[PDB]
Write a protein that binds this ligand. Structure first.
Ligand SMILES: OC[C@H]1O[C@@H]2O[C@H]3[C@H](O)[C@@H](O)[C@@H](O[C@H]4[C@H](O)[C@@H](O)[C@@H](O[C@H]5[C@@H](O)[C@@H](O)[C@@H](O[C@H]6[C@H](O)[C@@H](O)[C@@H](O[C@H]7[C@H](O)[C@@H](O)[C@@H](O[C@H]8[C@H](O)[C@@H](O)[C@@H](O[C@H]1[C@H](O)[C@H]2O)O[C@@H]8CO)O[C@@H]7CO)O[C@@H]6CO)O[C@@H]5CO)O[C@@H]4CO)O[C@@H]3CO
Ligand SMILES: OC[C@H]1O[C@@](CO)(O[C@H]2O[C@H](CO)[C@@H](O)[C@H](O)[C@H]2O)[C@@H](O)[C@@H]1O
Ligand SMILES: OC[C@H]1O[C@@](CO)(O[C@H]2O[C@H](CO)[C@@H](O)[C@H](O)[C@H]2O)[C@@H](O)[C@@H]1O
Ligand SMILES: [Ca+2]
Ligand SMILES: [Ca+2]
Ligand SMILES: [Ca+2]
Ligand SMILES: [Ca+2]
Ligand SMILES: [Zn+2]
Length: 435
């Protein structure tokens, strides 16, 4: 990749959103975007589930039917998945790899859908658990492979009305990851580097742990909970990273309501994943399931300058926000951001913090202003004592340097928040002459 790799905390692009254009053109669409994402500093792409789903040509992938049909068997009324053919998928992966970018597959293994009806002794009724017809001929299944069964009635959670998979059955382990013939092995064989596990609240962390024992690779789990204790417990149990939903709702509370103290308080009190373990937190401003933050500029300024591993939402980058402003923030993340963090000042509409630097990365000062007027303030930032500092976004109207006195004091400024008029409500500073 152009800067940091995925394994080194590099920026991730979520390469989709809910109900992307059907017509089997999305792998190709993504493939065409990657040279640009590369130039932008993106380290890896998270793609939607690739298998043939119950919904066939219009499935978003979260109702998997034939795990080993990546869009090449005529099934569920289509050959290709919503996103394209197996060949197109392979092509995109190959392109990604030509640009030193990694591909993170979306793994949906809580449940399955589109099975035929069959008598189920354990339920004393009929269930849609007959998967004998799968065209790949791999990982057929029946009622024994779902809950409830002879082993037990159920597990930590279910999703939709979809048959709920019993990972405790040898057959299911073998086919999903525990063999050279498994679904994991198959993805890995076509170049999948890394993993995003869907709805990990639905089954035990040992599943993900054993998957990673077999296959390795960077991994994140979607554990949708604001309870940081429960999220991290799962992260440490599974060995995987976790999406920071806690931060997400806190950024909404703060940036959409001029209530920055709600964010600061959550950071200080360990009520975000990132402020408790920045090596586990995968941060984001929106995803395909939820998009409640209207005030995205400060939210992106935050996650691209603060600790953690940030994700860019496809729609935000490609449609809704100023792409060049995001490229800039990605540049800042990869060239300046590093080190521990100190909050320098905050109130209802202002947030200033310093990153103290680490390795090659000098560190930085971020200044978020939610107010409708330009903001300026004396702040004590001893990290930069006696140094020329330069503003790296251009948000103050051009080239701006300032001098941090030996005393540690500087008069820092941030533009008004008024995006309609090119005023984006943040400035970012570091030593002069970095790049
Ligand atoms: O540089 C990449 C990075 O940038 C961000 O990280 C910053 C933090 O957010 C910020 O708080 C500060 O980190 C400090 C930290 O919070 C303190 O607790 C302390 O760290 C101690 C201590 O916690 C202790 O455990 C030990 O650390 C050891 C490990 O225990 C050991 O296993 C190994 O660590 C490796 C990992 O285990 C691998 O997973 C791997 O990690 C990477 C991440 O997963 C990743 O997302 C990314 O990190 C960024 C992060 O998300 C940002 O928020 O890149 C990774 C690095 O390649 O690889 C490593 C290394 O081989 O070894 C380490 C020590 O090197 O001892 C600690 C102190 O040495 O102190 C700090 C530092 O101030 O600063 C950073 C860095 O910018
Ligand atoms: O278990 C999947 C595994 O089988 C291999 C060959 O050993 O590929 C076969 O199965 C794939 C999935 O249905 C087919 O697409 C492929 O054409 C077929 O040879 C491995 O490639 C794969 O990992
Ligand atoms: O790193 C190899 C190996 O370590 C595990 C934990 O067993 O994951 C750790 O390392 C990852 C990459 O550095 C981190 O992202 C992860 O959070 C951490 O637990 C395995 O998953 C991985 O195969
Ligand atoms: Ca196609
Ligand atoms: Ca389940
Ligand atoms: Ca909101
Ligand atoms: Ca104020
Ligand atoms: Zn079970």
């Amino acid at each position: 990749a152009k800067y940091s790799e995925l394994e080194k905390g590099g920026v991730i692009m979520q390469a989709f959103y809910w109900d992307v254009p059907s017509g089997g053109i999305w792998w190709d669409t993504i493939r065409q975007k990657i040279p640009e994402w590369y130039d932008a500093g993106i380290s890896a792409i998270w793609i939607p589930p690739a298998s043939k789903g119950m919904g066939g040509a219009y499935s978003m992938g979260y109702d998997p039917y034939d795990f080993f049909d990546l869009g090449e068997y005529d099934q569920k009324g289509t050959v290709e998945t919503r996103f394209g053919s197996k060949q197109e998928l392979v092509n995109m992966i190959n392109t990604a790899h030509a640009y030193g970018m990694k591909v993170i597959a979306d793994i949906v293994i809580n449940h399955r859908a589109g099975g035929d009806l069959e008598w189920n002794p354990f339920v004393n009724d009929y269930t849609w658990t007959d998967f004998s017809k799968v065209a790949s001929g791999k990982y057929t299944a029946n009622y024994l492979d779902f809950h409830p069964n002879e082993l037990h009635a159920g597990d930590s959670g279910t999703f939709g009305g979809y048959p709920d998979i019993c990972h405790d059955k040898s057959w299911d382990q073998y086919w999903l990851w525990a063999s050279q013939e498994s679904y994991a092995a198959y993805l890995r064989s076509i170049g999948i580097d890394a993993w995003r596990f869907d709805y990990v609240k639905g089954y035990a962390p040992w599943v993900v742990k054993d998957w990673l024992n077999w296959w390795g690779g960077w991994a994140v789990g979607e554990y949708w909970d604001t309870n940081v204790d429960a999220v991290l417990n799962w992260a440490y149990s599974s060995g995987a990273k976790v999406f920071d939903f806690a931060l997400y709702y806190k950024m909404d509370e703060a940036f959409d309501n001029k209530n920055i103290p709600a964010l600061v308080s959550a950071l200080q009190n360990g009520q975000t994943v990132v402020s408790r373990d920045p090596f586990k937190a995968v941060t984001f401003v929106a995803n395909h399931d939820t998009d409640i933050i209207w005030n995205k500029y400060p939210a992106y300024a935050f996650i691209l300058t603060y600790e953690g591993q940030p994700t860019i939402f496809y729609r935000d980058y490609e449609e809704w926000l100023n792409k060049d402003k995001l490229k800039n923030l990605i540049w800042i993340h990869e060239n300046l951001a590093g080190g521990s963090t100190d909050i320098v000042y905050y109130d209802n509409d202002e947030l200033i913090f310093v990153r103290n630097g680490y390795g090659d990365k000098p560190g930085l000062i971020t200044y978020i202003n939610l107010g409708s007027s330009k903001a300026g303030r004396w702040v004590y930032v001893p990290k930069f004592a006696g140094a020329c500092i330069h503003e790296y976004t251009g948000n103050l109207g051009g080239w701006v340097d300032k001098y941090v006195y030996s005393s540690g004091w500087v008069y820092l400024e941030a533009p008004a928040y008024d995006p309609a008029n090119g005023q984006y409500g943040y400035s970012v500073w570091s030593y002069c002459g970095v790049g």
